[PDB]
């Protein structure tokens, strides 16, 4: 007769007694079972033929992905503390430095800025947000889906910002046409076009080792140092101390995003292969990305260098890692 | 050796029962009364148990074998009483 | 000062562009996002009712996990299930067990949204609907793992899903069928609008009040905090019918509506109907699991069905119909098969219980409770091996559950089977057959516990076998939950 | 990034300056600082041992306020003070009548210090003190507020201190005593180092399991809560008896102490003794008062004033005497005159509690046990009305508590009489004699209820009037707990 | 045999079903139940004395005090709610600006003038958490000591900002003397005599009616015109954007007093008399306020101006209440 | 009329009781015993009940009245039992 257990049976001995996020994200996935039959139904469905060639034959190859952990061991308790946190300073930024009448302080020319490079975000943000939602679902472990879980919650996030920023602007610069030209200049204006390529194709990068390279590995970084960390500075220098702090309080999820990302390409070099498999992959989207920063931060003043620093800035990401 | 699922009457859900390709459905109904007879269903002594094919009903003699009865691995059966 | 949600929520959904490095059929693919023919700007018009926004959220929902987090400490010590009615001990190993991983399982049917819907709306509401899914995961395997020192049946609450046992499978079959293998418009509408919104929403709510009336506070708020996100992303299936309805495909919707509820249903009646019916003390029993349906269930689905312009479904009579039998058959087929579950069973057949039986099924004790009384008499002399079975229960291909039905004078057990490309199906009910015959292609080479025993895939080939093939063992294999007291009042 | 608290924390009390547009004596008034000759400088060693930072605390402390509430919007349909026993409604309805506004006075007690204390730490200290009562006073009205429809009894939670029943009157004599008419440097030794320090801390933690036994989750919450923020205000006192003893007064400190602890120790035997051995169901009783306070109590006084360089209070040896009488004086003393308090005082003298008692207390049925004999008897042989009283006891002019002790074989109640200016007080014993003497002009004409009803001050000038008197009235007029229910176990 | 009652007896019977505010908060206090013996011992004890003065015979009268009502209904409860978010705020405001090295980018002119004007003002922060806290345990009625409360909790609270701040600039600049040289410039700094003598003598202003007035109608408007106002305005235009937008963070605390010391005006004036005994305190302080406003303000750059709008923006505080 | 304070022996609180100036000592433990035996104490019947000054222990003779004892108001007495 089976005697009760000191923890759940799949952690039963180990002995540094688990802790919360152990207990409560770890071998939560089932389609792994039988990588043959994913699921409990025909094995020819469209979605048992996805799986078993989007996850399962996936070239970035590892004995037991269930050991991955989240450097940061986020739950779900604990990333709306962390945020609640961190969305009471920015609220809080919003409403007091709006009593000051911070955005009526900004010129006519950062105004302009703004419409064209800032708010169009919104597009180039939600992507992302779907571009993490896809990894959450395709990735062979809870606990790799978690980390794309909660960086899916972040991206709706600076999503959400920016709209709501939107709105603030085009109450105050109502002739600008705030929220209302953002899809155009999203869709045909060449500072814009170099990061629409490179995430509406790395959004049908459909393999969840690619997705995750793709999309965490060298989309992000390159978007991170296009749009948060050269356009904060300069709006910084240009008087608008709002998008300063905003994108820098954002800078901070992409840094968590960032730590995990490491955290599973140091777990993907345990095995013979696979950094060579990273590579490649790298190789492959790392030319879209630096199209990206070309085409976006050469039309920012100071161009050349913006192009110089987010280019070295995100390959430094990745460098880190091996 | 042939399996069938057994549908007893009065029983409330319908069971693997294993036979043999020479049993008669005599055998047959013996081998299901066991998985139900004095486990939810009461005995009926002053009756007789015959098998019928429960897709279409038909009935089968007490002495038919089951390789004469051309039934599809798995058929269900119904085990009713009668005289 | 802020603005108000209502002038800037908008801007939030206004993410739709038209792609050009790459097709839309490309960005959106037809199998996972089932878009079917009808456009973006047509899909543009799906407005959720319920509206929220990010700080809005981790907000609120901060504040929920708070509460729950902190009642379950202070009650922690006070040990109650130590003392609780093994009823409920039993009705709470089985809900962790069935749901726990189900329920981290449905983050990802969320994700299938939130990534392939065209509706800009749909895609953030599922977003939210992911992190939800994620809690209900997270929470409903911390609040059991309080008690795995108390019995292995607990592990049972993460471990469950990963195993082969029957009603494991049932419970697969259920979501893979529903959430985790359909294309986006199709998940809202089958796991959001028929089983959420129709179902588990409702349910929960009693399930909450049953939790407070056993004197189960840490589960009581634990059930009806995790209710109240329901809300939140069950809404999502609503507005995709309407536009479904609205443009060609009626007929579509409705098809999936009536596939999503029927199947709902049978699962609904063997993890639901026993307990109300007989795990919960009969002095705790406000309503039958009937007139439960029949209140707030079945009536919901009819103002539901008639709003968006649907039908009721073609097999609605006989569902009302059924509701006086099938939770019976599922209840005494799990107590019989005892043993290959992993929580204790409530018989929940003494006198009183068969009178109060008697009367919210008028006929009960002539047809189910014939069964009864033969497992009875051999309890009460001393034949106790004829309780328990010898064999496997036939179990229906679609439900994958044991078909059963009204015994005793009105016996009437049926079996649908079907035979097709060479290879004899059963299913439990006629809905159930036809589930599999307006899509054969999804169910066809899935072969239920039968099947697998009937095939050599269980070995050794005995019923010892198949309960290591389903990974119980003595300590989580149940037993009488009330450790037969009931029977000692027959003597 | 951010600093260590370690880093910055000094600066956050490094407030003190000399004054120079007004004299130092001006802005610090002796009768309010009470600095007793010692410099700023001098006072500028204090030093507190728990630190906390204003972020830290509303941070702190809004997490605690979000359990506390939640937990009782959790339970409070549960209505389990309806069902649970009546010793346990009694403890309540007594806890906050007489603690709840003496909660919130001790908030101007903190007010007292965070003004007038020389010592910057005591300061801020007292001002995170200031809140903390603040927090007792609302949640400890907030809470019983959820059963003013229950009975009025409950109302007195607010009432009470506003009323002059003789328990009031005794309440309000202690606490104005040592916290609201005391210079600060008094109030903290008196009243945090003394009293909460060395009294209430435990005592509520005692309290918290004791609600936890009963069943009142609610109240154990709430109990325990309220008692993790003792700790932060009730160090105060330590560090300014330190100052004290290492300037010249260790006799003023000494003297404080003794006072402090013995007025304590009065309220606490009629307040805290009588409920543990008492109401508490024998069944829950892991020791009795005696025990308790030997335990928790007084080992922890003796340790305390060793290290900080004091001596055990002269009466030392009379106290411990005292724990095996005092309080089954106060019980009996509250239970006979039960109609003129506002709960229901549980007899708790039935054959096996009296076992108990006289386990816990050898010689208890040859003392206390007769008086109860006679009271039982009587009710036995229904003659009711010669349980109830037709006079009033002997107020102690002190402490404000009927004057009791030993009555059976050991007869030994003594009065410690005083004669002082043409007025003859009468003392429940010789440190509360003391008291008076140290310090005459402190409560030389007060007058105790006795004193009132024979100075004509209450009219009618007869039991009636005395109830009318105190505010009392059918409904909140206490009677026997259990309504007599031990009885029937003598017949 | 008395029936139970709806609410609390003395709320009993106004209808409009009480608040969890008054549930708590109402007539609390119990020394006020005997005038001429306010405490359970000797009538002739100082403290007796003290509260038969200072409460009682308080020229500032009204019938029934209790009926006062605190107009953001504040209990302990939804203060730290309150709070807690402003100072999630306030703490992001910190650890971000530092980040990114915002003392680093002020200049030494900058800096001094912080020596000078902003962190000495712990101690006059404090002297008002002393006064504030007087006012608590003098005043005729529990709604009007838990205003006190709060407020006093909030002075300890700017006060805490500033020593935390003092660390922050000590750190960055250690040859300034920040931290170590403060009480001299308290003590010693002509711009400062003005306000430390208007508070160390309105802190012996023992009248509950005086002592309010004094601190709550006077010194307050001034030290918060004087030093958030004014000070912060000059450090927005120097560079120093914390400064700037903590001093806003606290006026924020500073308007939520106004609020409250209105009301109890507001109420005072139902009463014959009172207006004429509150402007007769004012008219008393006013001279003592206006110059601190002098020498502290004629001391910042620009200086008659700052003493321009704080003496008639503090006046306006009054002004609008009668 | 005069009050005395009565500590009846075996008793367990001293109460307030009302006398009359004019009282004999063995009235005066009439009107305490009245508050006392048949409550808290059993009677005595072969013994008798004495007065004397709870402070120094004077004992009155059971024929003294109230007046003749020279008694402070409110003066405490203990009411014990002799023959
Ligand atoms: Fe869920
Ligand atoms: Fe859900
Ligand atoms: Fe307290
Ligand atoms: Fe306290």
């Known amino acids: 007769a089976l005697k009760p257990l000191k923890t759940w049976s799949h952690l039963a001995g180990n002995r540094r007694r688990p802790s919360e996020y152990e207990v409560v994200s770890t071998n939560l996935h089932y389609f792994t079972d039988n990588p043959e039959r994913p699921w409990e139904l025909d094995s020819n469905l469209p979605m048992q033929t996805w799986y078993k060639k989007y996850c399962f034959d996936s070239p970035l190859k590892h004995d037991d992905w269930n050991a991955f952990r989240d450097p940061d061991q986020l739950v779900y308790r604990t990333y709306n503390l962390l945020q609640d946190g961190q969305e009471s300073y920015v609220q809080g930024l919003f409403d007091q430095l709006n009593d000051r009448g911070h955005d009526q302080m900004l010129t006519r020319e950062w105004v302009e800025t703004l419409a064209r490079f800032y708010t169009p975000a919104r597009y180039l943000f939600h992507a992302l947000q779907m571009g993490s939602v896809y990894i959450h679902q395709i990735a062979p472990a809870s606990t790799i889906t978690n980390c794309a879980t909660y960086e899916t919650a972040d991206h709706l996030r600076w999503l959400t910002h920016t709209a709501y920023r939107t709105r603030e602007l085009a109450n105050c610069y109502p002739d600008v046409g705030f929220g209302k030209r953002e899809r155009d200049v999203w869709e045909n204006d060449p500072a814009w076009q170099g990061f629409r390529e490179l995430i509406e194709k790395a959004l049908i990068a459909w393999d969840w080792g690619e997705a995750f390279t793709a999309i965490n590995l060298v989309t992000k970084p390159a978007v991170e140092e296009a749009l948060l960390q050269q356009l904060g500075s300069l709006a910084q220098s240009e008087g608008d101390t709002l998008l300063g702090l905003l994108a820098q309080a954002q800078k901070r999820d992409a840094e968590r995003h960032r730590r995990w990302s490491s955290a599973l390409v140091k777990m993907a070099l345990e095995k013979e292969g696979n950094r060579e498999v990273l590579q490649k992959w790298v190789a492959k989207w790392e030319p879209l990305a630096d199209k990206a920063i070309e085409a976006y931060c050469s039309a920012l003043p100071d161009g050349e260098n913006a192009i110089v620093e987010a280019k070295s800035a995100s390959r430094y990401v990745r460098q880190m890692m091996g | ?83 | 000062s802020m603005l108000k949600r209502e002038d800037w929520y908008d801007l939030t959904r206004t993410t739709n562009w038209t792609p050009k490095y790459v097709t839309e059929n490309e960005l959106f693919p037809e199998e996972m996002s089932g878009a079917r023919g009808i456009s973006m700007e047509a899909w543009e018009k799906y407005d959720e009712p319920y509206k929220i926004t990010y700080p809005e959220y981790v907000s609120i929902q901060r504040e929920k996990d708070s509460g729950a987090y902190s009642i379950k400490a202070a009650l922690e010590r006070d040990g109650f299930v130590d003392r609780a009615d093994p009823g409920w001990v039993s009705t709470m190993q089985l809900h962790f067990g069935a749901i726990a991983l189900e329920e981290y399982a449905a983050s990802t049917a969320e994700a299938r949204m939130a990534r392939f819907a065209k509706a800009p709306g749909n895609r953030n509401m599922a977003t939210f609907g992911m992190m939800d899914e994620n809690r209900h995961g997270q929470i409903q395997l911390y609040f059991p793992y309080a008690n795995v020192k108390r019995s292995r049946k607990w592990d049972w609450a993460h471990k469950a899903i990963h195993t082969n046992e029957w009603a494991a499978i049932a419970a697969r079959s259920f979501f893979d069928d529903m959430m985790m293998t359909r294309d986006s418009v199709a998940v809202s509408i089958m796991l959001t609008f028929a089983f959420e919104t129709g179902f588990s929403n409702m349910q929960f709510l009693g399930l909450a009040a049953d939790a407070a009336e056993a004197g189960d506070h840490t589960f009581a708020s634990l059930i009806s905090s995790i209710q109240t996100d329901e809300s939140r992303h069950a809404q999502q299936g609503g507005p995709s019918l309407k536009i479904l309805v609205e443009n060609g495909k009626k007929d579509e919707a409705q098809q999936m509506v009536d596939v999503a509820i029927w199947r709902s249903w049978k699962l609904f009646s063997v993890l639901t109907g026993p307990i109300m019916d007989y795990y919960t003390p009969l002095e705790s029993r406000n309503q039958s699991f009937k007139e439960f349906m029949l209140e707030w269930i079945v009536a919901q689905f009819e103002r539901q069905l008639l709003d968006l312009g649907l039908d009721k479904p073609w097999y609605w009579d006989q569902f009302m119909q059924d509701l006086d039998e099938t939770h019976h058959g599922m209840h005494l087929g799990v107590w019989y098969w005892r043993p290959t579950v992993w929580w204790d069973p409530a018989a929940g057949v003494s006198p009183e219980e068969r009178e109060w039986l008697e009367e919210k099924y008028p006929g009960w004790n002539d047809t189910w409770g014939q069964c009864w009384d033969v497992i009875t008499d051999n309890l009460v002399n001393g034949k106790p091996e004829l309780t328990v079975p010898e064999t496997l229960p036939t179990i229906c291909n679609m439900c994958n559950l044991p078909i059963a039905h009204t015994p005793g004078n009105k016996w009437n057990v049926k079996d649908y089977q079907l035979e097709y490309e060479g290879r004899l199906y059963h299913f439990g009910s006629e809905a159930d057959r036809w589930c599999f015959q307006i899509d054969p292609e999804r169910y066809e080479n899935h072969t239920n516990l039968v099947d697998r025993f009937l095939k050599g895939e269980i070995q050794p080939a005995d019923l010892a076998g198949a309960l290591m093939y389903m990974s119980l063992e003595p300590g989580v294999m149940g037993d009488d939950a009330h450790d037969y007291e009931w029977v000692k009042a027959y003597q």
Request: aromatic share 8%; charged share 30%; with cysteine.
């Open chain 2, 1 to 83: 050796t042939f399996p069938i699922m057994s549908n007893f009457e009065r029983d409330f859900v319908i069971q693997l029962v294993p036979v043999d390709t020479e049993d008669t459905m005599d055998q047959v109904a013996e081998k299901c009364a066991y998985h139900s007879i004095n486990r939810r269903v009461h005995p009926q002594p002053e009756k007789i148990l015959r098998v019928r094919r429960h897709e279409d009903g038909t009935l089968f003699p007490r002495g038919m074998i089951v390789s004469d009865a051309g039934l599809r691995p798995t058929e269900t059966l119904d085990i009713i009483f009668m005289d």
